[PDB]
Design a protein around this ligand. Structure first.
Ligand SMILES: [Zn+2]
Ligand SMILES: [Zn+2]
Lengths: 182, 182
C-alpha cells in the first residue's frame, strides 16, 4: 500500500467514524493567529499544549517559523489575510527548542542537493537567497524576538494588533512567554 | 483573562495532565510533507482526516497553501528542509473547498488596510507583489493543480520525489485525490 492509498483509506475510516460534524465558522473564534514550526513533533501537539481548539485560531507553519523580511512572504501574507479578511486581533509567534533550523546551513543543504542530482549551477543561484532562511537562523529565542520585531515594523500591519513571542519545548510541550505584546 | 493568559493557563493544565511524554524522533517517520491552508477549520482536523499522527509528517501551512513561484518562498524552503535535512520522500499539497483566498483580492485587502489607517502609499507599494498571492488564487482545485506544478518544476526539488494534490472539505473532512504524483 502506497502513502496515498493509506491516506485514502484513513479518510474513509475517518468519515465513517465522524458521520455528521457541526459546521464551524470560517473565522477564528478567538481572533488569534499562531505562527509556528513545521516540526513533526508539534503536529497534533502544539495546539493542545496552548489550549487552542479547532475553529479558534489560524495556524501558519514553516521551517523555523521566521519572519526576517518587512516586505511580503508566505507567512506575512497569511497574517494580512488573518487580520483583514478573517478578523484576527492578536498574533502569537511560537518557536521551539531544538529547532534544527539552528544547525541547518546552505552548505549542508547544498551537499544534500548535489547528492540528489540537483545542478551545481542551480545550487549556486539560490544559495544567497536560501541563506536568509537557514544561516540567519542563529537561535530559537533570537529568531522569536527578531520575528516579533519584523512583523511589528511591517507597514501593512496595524499598530493596534499585539504581537507575542512564545517558545514551546517539542518533547514536554512546556510553553514559556518570551515577548508580551499588549 | 487575556488570550496570552489563557494560553499560559492552558499550558500549565496541559503539563499537569501529561507529566512525562515519550520523546519522538525529530524526523517524520512516514517521510512525508503536508502543505495545507491556515484555515481555522483544519486545525486539529486535517491530520486526523488523512490519518496522519504526531511524529509522522512535517506540516506546512499558509493562507491558500499556494506555490506560485519556482524560486524560493517560506513554503518552498520548508519543503527543501523536509527533503534534504529531514528525509521526506513524498509531498502532499492539500487545498480545501470554500478557501478564503478565492474571494480575497488586493482591492478588498486594500480597502481593509485603509480602514485600519495604513498609509495609502504603502498599500500601493506592495499592491503588485501582494497580487501574486491573492489575485492569482482563482479556484481551490486550480490552485492545487498549479501548486503541484510549481513544486515539480522547481529546480531545487529532485525528480524522484512524488508531488500529490489533494482536496479536503473543511466541514465534512472528505478528502479527494486531485493529482497522483507517483
Ligand atoms: Zn523547527
Ligand atoms: Zn484556505
Amino acid at each position: 500500500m502506497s502513502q496515498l492509498e493509506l491516506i485514502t483509506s484513513a479518510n474513509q475510516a475517518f468519515l465513517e467514524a465522524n458521520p455528521e460534524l457541526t459546521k464551524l465558522n470560517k473565522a477564528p473564534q478567538r481572533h488569534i493567529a499562531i505562527v509556528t514550526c513545521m516540526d513533526t513533533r508539534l503536529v497534533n501537539f502544539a495546539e493542545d499544549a496552548i489550549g487552542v481548539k479547532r475553529g479558534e485560531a489560524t495556524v501558519i507553519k514553516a521551517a523555523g517559523n521566521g519572519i526576517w523580511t518587512t516586505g511580503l512572504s508566505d507567512i506575512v501574507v497569511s497574517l494580512l489575510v488573518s487580520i483583514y479578511e478573517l478578523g484576527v486581533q492578536e498574533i502569537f509567534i511560537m518557536g521551539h527548542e531544538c529547532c534544527g533550523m539552528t544547525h541547518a546551513s546552505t552548505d549542508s543543504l547544498g551537499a544534500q542537493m548535489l547528492k540528489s542530482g540537483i545542478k551545481p549551477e542551480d545550487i549556486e543561484k539560490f544559495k544567497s537567497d536560501l541563506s536568509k532562511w537557514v544561516d540567519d537562523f542563529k537561535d530559537p529565542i533570537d529568531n522569536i524576538k527578531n520575528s516579533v520585531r519584523c512583523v511589528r515594523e511591517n507597514p501593512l500591519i496595524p499598530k493596534n494588533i499585539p504581537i507575542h513571542g512564545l517558545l514551546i519545548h517539542p518533547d514536554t510541550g512546556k510553553v514559556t512567554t518570551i515577548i508580551n505584546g499588549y
